[PDB]
Amino acid sequence: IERLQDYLLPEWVSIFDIADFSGRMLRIRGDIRPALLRLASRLAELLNESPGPRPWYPHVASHMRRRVNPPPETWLALGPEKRGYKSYAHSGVFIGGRGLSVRFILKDEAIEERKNLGRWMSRSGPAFEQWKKKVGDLRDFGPVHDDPMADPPKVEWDPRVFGERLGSLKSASLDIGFRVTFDTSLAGIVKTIRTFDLLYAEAEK
Numbered sequence: 001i002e003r004l005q006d007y008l009l010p011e012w013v014s015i016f017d018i019a020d021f022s023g024r025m026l027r028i029r030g031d032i033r034p035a036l037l038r039l040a041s042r043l044a045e046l047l048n049e050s051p052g053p054r055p056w057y058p059h060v061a062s063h064m065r066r067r068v069n070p071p072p073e074t075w076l077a078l079g080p081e082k083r084g085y086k087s088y089a090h091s092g093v094f095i096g097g098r099g100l101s102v103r104f105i106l107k108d109e110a111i112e113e114r115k116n117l118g119r120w121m122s123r124s125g126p127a128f129e130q131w132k133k134k135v136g137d138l139r140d141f142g143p144v145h146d147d148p149m150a151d152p153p154k155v156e157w158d159p160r161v162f163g164e165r166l167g168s169l170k171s172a173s174l175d176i177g178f179r180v181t182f183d184t185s186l187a188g189i190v191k192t193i194r195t196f197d198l199l200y201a202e203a204e205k
């Protein structure tokens with residue numbers, strides 16, 4: 001049974017205990033990146049075995065923007081475009097000092113897709129709440145973006161107001177999902193990513 005730890009070694013969480021930029025980046029780029037590329041490819045193959053409402057193409061964080069503060073986490077992204085991913089909805093598998101997580105992301109620069117998903121959330125609060133109940137322990141990673149070891153809070157906001165903000169503010173963003181263990185099967189992770197399909201699809205239009 002293929003598992004996340006076959007790609008991302010459990011001990012790699014300690015890379016994120018390296019406080020200095022150069023030292024942490026060396027390990028993120030040298031050791032974690034090749035593994036994330038392999039894992040991203042494999043997850044995309046598995047997802048594409050049963051097509052969903054949008055394509056999934058693999059990407060890996062480039063870390064070309066950081067200078068002084070090392071990344072608190074690194075990730076692969078699965079999104080609808082072959083090259084680039086930050087301008088569109090995507091799912092990601094992340095590793096940092098806290099371990100692994102699987103999240104659904106709309107960055108501030110995904111202006112149009114935030115407008116689309118925000119409008120859906122605003123108009124479909126009850127459907128969002130139903131979905132949230134079904135997926136269990138949904139966390140908001142937004143508030144802990146500056147607290148790498150902190151347990152992210154449960155999503156408790158009103159999706160209608162959150163959606164209104166997400167759609168209308170240039171600096172708004174979404175980052176929600178699940179903490180997962182290193183021994184989780186790839187088959188289980190694929191299904192977790194599929195549970196974001198409702199949001200992924202509604203972001204497109």
Ligand SMILES: [Cl-]
Nearest residue numbers: 084085086087
């Ligand atoms: Cl992009």
Ligand SMILES: [Cl-]
Nearest residue numbers: 183184185188
């Ligand atoms: Cl599993």
